[PDB]
């Protein structure tokens, strides 16, 4: 069928792509898979059918190195439709145990994120697509959250407060997933995420949840200067009263603390007050 | 207790509407039904201790109510051919950000508990705006304030009816009906629907004013008030069905006894 | 002096209460905006 | 005591301004909310 030109005097094409689907689940690891995606290639060179199957079968492939082939296929596939993402997020149920599936799906969707927009033409609507990610994070797994953090960090390189609040909840569940699957990579990505957040902070248009997140992540994993800015913003309110808040901070950073530098800091703050 | 009613209105006379004065008033006295809703609004944070400000709070309430209703209309999640408890479900799930996608989606336990409370709340307070604020704050303080004691309520109920009636407890152990007694309707759903609403907010006075285990005592006072029907049975199915098909005769006396019960174990 | 102190305290309480009151409207409006854009993209999928 | 009275007036003024700022924020949010609602009806204009 590689001989096939995009002309269709026929109709059974939907059945032949059903066959391509049925068979691609088990093919060669580097050639017959190339052939089956190659036969999928001219599908877009023709009008097509309900292809939720095409979604669920052009997804568990991004793991193995074929990135450019699937990238081209899906990029040019995003024409004549947009509902791709819709069924993508409809794939956020009963699938908590499908790490490669969700991995590939959301990594591809990251096209809709600031990293690289090879389509650049569709309705952006990122706030809408976000909480689907919170759902997909219903089960803790390394690589999925990994691509998630990589995609969100790329996106944030830039408004919509809702965008913020959502991704806030996202990284909140992230930090919730940290104390259990204590890998020695996501620690970095998370804390450096806090950092770059503190850098675009000046034009962040975000809320103060950030600071209280440090209180949740008060584990010294977070950098020291992080804690410096933290105590600064946290004392910023205390001006006339709210003493209980002051002394709570005092506890959290004079009794329960190791780095004497921030101890000096909170102490001089108290002195100033 | 008309003198109690005048003491209540003089507690409400000052533009500094404390809650702990009202809290004690509740914990020692059931409230006038006409003024119940009102104090609950201040009991449940819906209104600050300063009544003159409640004017603006009402505007904020009516606004966040019209807004959510109009939105649900726009998205067509809710249809005007729905009930009062059901119409509020779209607003809750939404306000809680967990609004589903299919209007015909199945429901979850919290949904039914919240749905039951809304039906009971509608009977308690005629004002829809007041009811939305009340049910919201009530379910809230359930799941965030008193959820500390909600899972371990049946064991406490056994302990507290134990030293006051072991006869209606000893037979249960033999009955093999203990681990299947679903006090949820009476503890989590808080009697909403099984007992007559029009005569139920008496205990809910102290509840909304912060009585958590009091339902335990009311549960005690459902095994005392209806001992014969439960005793005339053994299997957990007959027991729990009778608990469901409980008559609607003397909830008054049940709550009146649970008053002294809660006074006996707690104070 | 003490009297002025307590006056200040009560006024602070009042103001903060009536403020978080409207903050509820704020939160609700953001939620309404959110679900809106959600269904927006939904029907965008439903469009063609 | 005079300084304390001045401080009370300043705090009352600060409270007034923060309220109005938050309200205006809600208004701005309302403009996007109403604009978003409109575009919804426009696309309804399809069917």
Swiss-Prot record, chain A:
Post-translational modification: Phosphorylation by AMPK activates it and leads to negative regulation of the mTORC1 complex. Ubiquitinated by the DCX(FBXW5) E3 ubiquitin-protein ligase complex, leading to its subsequent degradation. Ubiquitinated by MYCBP2 independently of its phosphorylation status leading to subsequent degradation; association with TSC1 protects from ubiquitination.
Lineage top rank: taxon: Eukaryota
Subcellular location: Lysosome membrane; Cytoplasm, Cytosol
Tissue specificity annotation: Liver, brain, heart, lymphocytes, fibroblasts, biliary epithelium, pancreas, skeletal muscle, kidney, lung and placenta.
Record note on quaternary structure: Component of the TSC-TBC complex (also named Rhebulator complex), composed of 2 molecules of TSC1, 2 molecules of TSC2 and 1 molecule of TBC1D7. Probably forms a complex composed of chaperones HSP90 and HSP70, co-chaperones STIP1/HOP, CDC37, PPP5C, PTGES3/p23, TSC1 and client protein TSC2. Probably forms a complex composed of chaperones HSP90 and HSP70, co-chaperones CDC37, PPP5C, TSC1 and client protein TSC2, CDK4, AKT, RAF1 and NR3C1; this complex does not contain co-chaperones STIP1/HOP and PTGES3/p23. (Microbial infection) Interacts with human cytomegalovirus protein UL38; this interaction inhibits cellular stress response mediated by mTORC1.
Described function: Catalytic component of the TSC-TBC complex, a multiprotein complex that acts as a negative regulator of the canonical mTORC1 complex, an evolutionarily conserved central nutrient sensor that stimulates anabolic reactions and macromolecule biosynthesis to promote cellular biomass generation and growth. Within the TSC-TBC complex, TSC2 acts as a GTPase-activating protein (GAP) for the small GTPase RHEB, a direct activator of the protein kinase activity of mTORC1.
The name this protein goes by in its record: Tuberin
Source organism (scientific name): Homo sapiens
Curated annotation (Swiss-Prot), chain B:
Keywords attached to this entry: Cytoplasm, Cytoplasmic vesicle, GTPase activation, Lysosome, Membrane
Annotated tissue distribution: Highly expressed in heart, and slightly in kidney, liver and placenta.
GO terms for biological process, alphabetical: activation of GTPase activity; cellular response to starvation; negative regulation of cilium assembly; negative regulation of TOR signaling; negative regulation of TORC1 signaling; positive regulation of GTPase activity; positive regulation of protein ubiquitination; response to growth factor
A Pfam match: RabGAP-TBC
A GO CC annotation given for this chain: cytosol
Gene Ontology MF terms: GTPase activator activity; small GTPase binding; TSC1-TSC2 complex binding
Xref: PROSITE patterns: TBC_RABGAP
SUPFAM superfamilies: Ypt/Rab-GAP domain of gyp1p (SSF47923)
Domain named Rab-GAP TBC: residues: 30-211
Family matches, as InterPro entries: Rab-GAP-TBC_dom, Rab-GAP_TBC_sf, TBC1D7, TBC1D7_dom2
Subunit structure: Component of the TSC-TBC complex (also named Rhebulator complex), composed of 2 molecules of TSC1, 2 molecules of TSC2 and 1 molecule of TBC1D7. Interacts with TSC1 (via C-terminal half of the coiled-coil domain).
Function noted in UniProt: Non-catalytic component of the TSC-TBC complex, a multiprotein complex that acts as a negative regulator of the canonical mTORC1 complex, an evolutionarily conserved central nutrient sensor that stimulates anabolic reactions and macromolecule biosynthesis to promote cellular biomass generation and growth. The TSC-TBC complex acts as a GTPase-activating protein (GAP) for the small GTPase RHEB, a direct activator of the protein kinase activity of mTORC1.
Protein's recorded name: TBC1 domain family member 7
UniProtKB/Swiss-Prot annotation, chain C:
Effect upon mutating residue 19 to A: Abolished interaction with TBC1D7
Tissue note: Highly expressed in skeletal muscle, followed by heart, brain, placenta, pancreas, lung, liver and kidney. Also expressed in embryonic kidney cells.
Cellular compartment(s): Lysosome membrane; Cytoplasm, Cytosol
Function description: Non-catalytic component of the TSC-TBC complex, a multiprotein complex that acts as a negative regulator of the canonical mTORC1 complex, an evolutionarily conserved central nutrient sensor that stimulates anabolic reactions and macromolecule biosynthesis to promote cellular biomass generation and growth. The TSC-TBC complex acts as a GTPase-activating protein (GAP) for the small GTPase RHEB, a direct activator of the protein kinase activity of mTORC1.
Record text about domains: The C-terminal putative coiled-coil domain is necessary for interaction with TSC2.
Subunit relationships: Component of the TSC-TBC complex (also named Rhebulator complex), composed of 2 molecules of TSC1, 2 molecules of TSC2 and 1 molecule of TBC1D7. Probably forms a complex composed of chaperones HSP90 and HSP70, co-chaperones STIP1/HOP, CDC37, PPP5C, PTGES3/p23, TSC1 and client protein TSC2. Forms a complex composed of chaperones HSP90 and HSP70, co-chaperones CDC37, PPP5C, TSC1 and client protein TSC2, CDK4, AKT, RAF1 and NR3C1; this complex does not contain co-chaperones STIP1/HOP and PTGES3/p23.
Official protein name in the record: Hamartin
Species assigned in the record: Homo sapiens (Human)
Coverage span on the entire protein: 923 to 970 of 1164
